[PDB]
């Protein structure tokens, strides 16, 4: 029913009521604004569009993404908002309960809420079968010349080909990942911070999306 | 002999309104409606109705018998209705009315609730006797079947929910 955008700051720990140790992820979710309401009538489905982080205003001869371009400035100005660095949609919210241009404060979530956190996992670059697919090494001694190779990739005359989906070296990480059934440990109104039990995908400063757990 | 060729003596209270191919039998005890076969003739007198088949194939005899049986069942259900009786055997086996639904205590960790449907009314007389009355014969049979299948009878002691008059095959248990 709820959603908000934030940046992952880092990991720390808090002590629970019973003295239990709760590892937590600090998510900073300032400056969230509803930019657009998509509806079944116009777009074919219901969603709100949320911009997260304020950008600098447009200027001529801007060289980087720090400054809004004219299409982005117009789109944001339609919501009476500053242009935003990150923009994402939430289809799990009630379209009625939002006004275009309203803020989305962290206080929308309460302690004990069960949430799903979505983000882009850390990149690992080109990685082999051992690291990328958890495969086993060959022997490291006893004459072996097979240590980190992927092994056999097919059978023989039948099928005289490698099947689709064969696990092989390649770029690893940098994929969208949703971690389900995390919990809100604390919401701190100042500093606009949400404390999430456990760890969430991605590097520090990366964008995360928090939604009320679907399950 | 034959079943479909047999005539039906409609009740004086029941108004068998033959809506063409479709049929609708409003009577003292309720109303019924289902579309009879689209290849049969349902010509009726003022006080009687007699079904006739237009063909002679296997489908002709089969459809004629089933159509006449359905019509007679609708007439008898409008007139007198239908009663299904269930009996509970076993220590602690009881049933009760929670308003319209029926609760059964049949030895599970939980009771089982049997909800009432339209034109169906339940009734549990003693602790261990139940009854399913209604106009439609098929619906009454189906509800009684569900009530019985909550806990069907068992051979070693006859425990469970049995039909009134059901013969339960019994077996000595080699205790």
């Amino acid at each position: 029913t709820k959603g908000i955008l934030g940046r992952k700051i880092g990991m720390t720990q808090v002590f629970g009521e019973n003295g239990e140790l709760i590892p937590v992820t600090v998510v900073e979710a300032k400056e969230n604004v509803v930019l657009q309401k998509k509806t079944v009538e116009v777009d074919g489905y219901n969603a709100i569009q949320v911009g997260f982080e304020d950008k600098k205003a447009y200027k001529k001869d801007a060289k980087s993404n720090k400054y809004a371009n004219k299409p982005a400035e117009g789109h944001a100005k339609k919501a009476d908002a500053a242009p935003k660095r990150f923009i994402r949609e939430f289809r799990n919210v009630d379209v009625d309960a939002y006004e275009v241009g309203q803020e989305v404060s962290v206080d929308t979530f309460v302690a004990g809420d069960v949430i799903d956190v979505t983000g882009v996992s850390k990149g690992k670059g080109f990685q082999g079968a051992i690291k990328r697919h958890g495969q086993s090494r060959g022997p490291m001694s006893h004459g072996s010349h097979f240590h980190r190779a992927p092994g056999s990739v097919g059978m023989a005359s039948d099928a005289s080909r490698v099947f689709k989906g064969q696990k092989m070296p390649g770029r690893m990480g940098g994929n969208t990942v949703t971690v389900q059934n995390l919990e809100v440990v604390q919401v701190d109104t100042e500093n606009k911070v949400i404390l999430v039990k456990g760890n969430v995908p991605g590097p520090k400063k990366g964008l995360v999306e928090i939604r009320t757990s679907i399950k | 002999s034959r079943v479909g060729k047999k005539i039906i003596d409609i009740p004086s209270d029941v108004t068998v309104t033959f809506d063409g191919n479709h049929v609708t039998v409003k009577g003292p005890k309720g109303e019924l409606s289902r579309t009879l076969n689209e290849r049969m003739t349902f010509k009726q007198e003022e006080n009687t109705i007699e079904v006739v088949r237009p063909s002679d194939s296997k489908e002709d005899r089969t459809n004629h018998g089933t159509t006449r049986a359905l019509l007679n069942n609708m007439v008898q259900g409008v007139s007198q209705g239908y009663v299904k009786v269930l009996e509970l055997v076993g220590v602690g086996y009881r049933a009760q009315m929670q308003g319209k639904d029926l609760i059964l205590n049949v030895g599970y960790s939980h009771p089982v609730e049997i909800k009432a449907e339209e034109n169906i009314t339940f009734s549990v007389e003693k602790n261990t006797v139940v009854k399913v009355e209604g106009i439609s014969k098929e619906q009454v049979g189906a509800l009684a079947s569900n009530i019985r299948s909550v806990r069907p009878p068992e051979p070693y002691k006859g425990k469970g929910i049995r039909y009134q008059g059901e013969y339960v095959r019994r077996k000595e248990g080699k205790t």
Binding site: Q13, F15, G19, E20, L21 | -
Partner: protein, 122 residues
Amino acid sequence: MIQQETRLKVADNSGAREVLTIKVLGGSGRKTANIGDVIVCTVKNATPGGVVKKGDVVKAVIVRTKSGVRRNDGSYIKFDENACVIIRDDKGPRGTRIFGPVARELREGNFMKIVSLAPEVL
């Protein structure tokens, strides 16, 4: 972190001195046991005159590990050695005396007699 072929000192007076882990109980493919888990083991060394003889295949509960355990409050206990106690079917120790400190975790496993006999529970 006890696995197959791990050797543990015995912390009772059952007669076994050192045992070798044959199996970690608790499900298919389980590799490692820790404090409070039950293992199958063979007696490698035994004290003469004891009840449990060298070569016997017995069951033991781990009461001390070098890897130690982590507790719910973020605190840890680690020991300088790995030790176990030979138990009967009903979890009671086969011996009459327990030596060395044992971890509090044996309370959760209902090894209450072993807990009572130990000089120290930490």
